[PDB]
Structure 1
Amino acid sequence: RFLKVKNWETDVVLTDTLHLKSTLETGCTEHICMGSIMLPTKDQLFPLAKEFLDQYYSSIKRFGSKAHMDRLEEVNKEIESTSTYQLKDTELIYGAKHAWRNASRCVGRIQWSKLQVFDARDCTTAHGMFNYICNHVKYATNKGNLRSAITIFPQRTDGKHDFRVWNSQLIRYAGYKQPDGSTLGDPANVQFTEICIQQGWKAPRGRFDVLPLLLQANGNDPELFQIPPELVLEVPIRHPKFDWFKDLGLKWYGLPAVSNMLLEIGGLEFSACPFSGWYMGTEIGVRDYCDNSRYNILEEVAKKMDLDMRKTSSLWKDQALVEINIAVLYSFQSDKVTIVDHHSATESFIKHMENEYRCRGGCPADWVWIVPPMSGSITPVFHQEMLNYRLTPSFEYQPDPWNTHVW
């Protein structure tokens, strides 16, 4: 019931009590662990609302106060009659910050309380969504001095009137299948790029084509909008020591902005809640550039370094990997765009975990996602035992809308 986590490098032992408050299911059982699997009415609503408002009033040291009981009554009466309820602005901000705080897969949560919440619950059309999103993009980008933000569109009602951003992130690069058989641009986005052109988009058919937003308001068919190019801060990639690096013609965008998740607060579901932080360098240099199914550039780079690619044991891939990641950090740092390296970010997460254990009784964390995709054991998180469990408010992954939507 009370659980210990040990750090095997430092011998520090922490005690988790916060897991007792977990509600949702992990996917694991007593017989099987699913730790490495990526995806493992009025009546249900009031308990969820109550659970949330109790945590909210407790947070502002007003638990059991007249203002606490009055709000519970107000919300009960509103559900009883409207079938749903509306969050107070203060409740919404608290809920979003806490959904980030509870995101067990996020290494950047030391930052959780510094989150700018944009309340877009008054939005009614796709053009209105576009406006809010441009303002979010410009605010978060802040000329390279990035600031965490979330924009929250209206909550789910009967579920036939969902707001969705069809894009998986606000800013991504197009992918195109070629007669050649190969892929031009980002292979991750071939399907979406096709939905785009089929809906009208004039694809420039290049390697780094910023995708248009496909926005869905009030359950309507989505509409296309191009983000003003001047709002998309991109970084050309060069290496501090290798002059040839710039001739690979690589760039990435500065703003990582996840747009396909569902924010649940007090039983209310926000199906369009794009949020953004800033990158950890490995996300671009290891995953975006070197995944075999992504830009897959290891071979080209290793060749330009003239490494022995004849045998795996020369570690040519590992050498090229490190250089690519050096170039990513150097490029962002040189152009004054916020980026964090994996050493820094994971040291900050260990500090955050200790704060959370001290101040909250635990910190749900998914080791499989927290440990960086390179150099795992030379970061402190590798040696840190973590307990994974699901707390609300939460961000949840949700099915691609094209699989769902009826046109």
Structure 2
Amino acid sequence: RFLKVKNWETDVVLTDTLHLKSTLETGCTEHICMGSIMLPVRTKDQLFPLAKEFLDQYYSSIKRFGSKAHMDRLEEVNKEIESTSTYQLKDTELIYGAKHAWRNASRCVGRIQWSKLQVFDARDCTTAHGMFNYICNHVKYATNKGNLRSAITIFPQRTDGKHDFRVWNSQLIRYAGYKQPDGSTLGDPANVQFTEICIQQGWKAPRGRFDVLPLLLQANGNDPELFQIPPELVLEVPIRHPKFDWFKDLGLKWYGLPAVSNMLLEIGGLEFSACPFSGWYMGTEIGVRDYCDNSRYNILEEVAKKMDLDMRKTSSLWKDQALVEINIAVLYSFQSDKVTIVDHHSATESFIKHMENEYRCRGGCPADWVWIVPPMSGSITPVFHQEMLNYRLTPSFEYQPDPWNTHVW
């Protein structure tokens, strides 16, 4: 229970002590590692230890641990739980909880930024229409005309769990997908289902390739409702290449704001089932994953053809060649249009710096190597050579299943 991590490129060894404060289960056992499995109410009794654990860490953070003000809040929260079966966070607590859920997100390479997070408190929200208003304000604030700013917006916490707030979308901004008589897929094959659910709720799809999807918002356990985000709030980037004049003709674009909206924020045992958050893209996610995944826009073959490469044998590395050029183009387009983006070299470098800060100041940094190492050029980024320990700390973000599977109408 005192663990070393070694970087094999630099020989730097760091000692992890933070893992001992870890609480939740990993999915791994002594006999089986589940490191690469993507997926490996609360009663009164369960809630007070959770609240106490959180308030202790909070009061510790502001150097008032064991102070009258610490004990008094523990007292206040205990009474409120006993009498109301739940409790409410102070603004200061909510801000701290959200920043720490990000600090603890072991799959997140950009956490050097964790303390610069603008938190929008949407706990007074009561309808879908209000949710939409909050989300547009989030979008406009975060986008900031291309100078992106990290933000989260936090809707009301769970109660009896039959009144959840949820954003049905997996991200605030994504593109539609429709399956055609042709048998192929137009637009984003990842969202075919969600797009069907939208149309059957009433969306009129402009039956195209890069149709920004409508929001489906569920306030207070109600049936969700549709809203189109103002087109003028969705900053999109046309994709061109600095050297390939034909590239623009693929007709590719992507949206500037990555904004995850399906997670559950847990703070001091309280559960925030709608907490859309956003930062800015690492270029590989668009160029490697969205564009080149087989099940996504799947554009390797068309780009390779346009480059006039040898597609007859895997060993000519035509896929690898086209992959790099696609990613040069994503970075180039975002940079030309002055929209914040980070390349994988720069993002992984800052993360190693972040890991070292966290090791000296905090005793560790939970990190999931399988997600942290970029989907291309892994071993030429410093994170490939860095041992990481993965463990679960709270406050946390947790993945929740798609609500259409669940919800009753």
**TM-score normalized with structure 2 length:** 0.99
Displacement after TM superposition at 1:211 (Å): 0.1
Distance across 1 between alignment mates of 2:187 and 2:38:
25
Asked if 1:5 corresponds to 2:2, the answer is no
Q: State the Cα deviation string for residues 285-344 of structure 1 (Å, max 9, x = none).
A: 000000000000000000000000000000000000000000000000000000000000
- Equivalence for 1:19: 19
**1:223-254, CA deviations, whole angstroms, 9 ceiling, x for partnerless residues?**
00000000000000000000000000000000
Report the secondary structure of 1:308's partner residue.
coil
Secondary structure of 2:286 counterpart: helix
Backbone CA RMSD of aligned residues: 0.2
| CA shift for structure 1 position 88 | 0.1
Give the Cα–Cα distance (whole angstroms) in 2 for the partners of residues 96 and 82 of structure 1. 24
Per-residue deviation, residues 120-148 of structure 1 (Å, max 9, x unmatched): 00000000000000000000000000000
Q: What SS is found at the alignment partner of 2:319? A: helix
Q: What stretches of structure 1 of length at least 5 have no aligned partner?
A: none
Deviations 1:76-123 (A, max 9, x none): 000000000000000000000000000000000000000000000000
The alpha-carbon deviation at position 158 of structure 1 amounts to 0.2
Aligned residue-pair number: 407
Q: Matched residues in 2 for 1:188 and 1:279: separation?
A: 18
Question: How much does 1:47 deviate?
Answer: 0.1
Match of 2:123 in 1: 121
Q: Distance in 2 between matches of 1:403 and 1:129?
A: 22
Distance in 2, Cα, partners of 1:77 & 1:136: 34
Name the SS of the counterpart of 2:158 in structure 1. Answer: coil
1-structure distance, mates of 2:85, 2:403: 25
Tell me the equivalent position of 1:396: 398
C-alpha offsets along residues 185-221 of structure 1, whole Å, 9 cap, x if unaligned?
0000000000000000000010000000000000000
Deviation for aligned residue 1:268: 0.0
CA distance in 1, matches of 2:345, 2:403: 36
Alpha-carbon offset, residue 402 of structure 1? 0.4
Deviation at 1:65, TM superposition (A): 0.1
Post-superposition Cα deviations, 1:356-383, rounded to whole Å, max 9, x if no partner, equal 0000000000000000000000000000
Distance in 1 (CA, whole Å) between partners of 2:120 and 2:79 is: 27
Q: Say which SS state the counterpart of residue 279 (structure 1) adopts.
A: coil
CA distance in 1, matches of 2:5, 2:401: 34
Provide the rounded CA distance (Å) in 2 between the counterparts of 1:198 and 1:24.
Answer: 39
SS of the counterpart of 1:45? Answer: helix
Secondary structure in structure 2 of the residue aligned to 1:5: strand
Task: Give the SS at the match of 2:361.
Answer: helix
Classify the secondary structure of the residue corresponding to 2:8. coil
Residue 162 (structure 2) aligned to one of 134, 153, 160: 160
Give the whole-Å Cα distance in 1 for the aligned partners of 2:312 and 2:404. Answer: 44
Instruction: Write the mapping of 1:133-212 to structure 2, written as runs, cut at 5 A.
Output: 133-212=135-214
Question: What secondary structure sits across from 2:246 in the alignment?
Answer: helix
Distance 2:137 2:191 in 1: 25
SS at match of 1:176: strand
CA distance in 2: counterparts of 1:255 and 1:71, whole angstroms: 38
Task: Measure the CA separation in 2 of the matches of 1:256 and 1:358.
Answer: 31
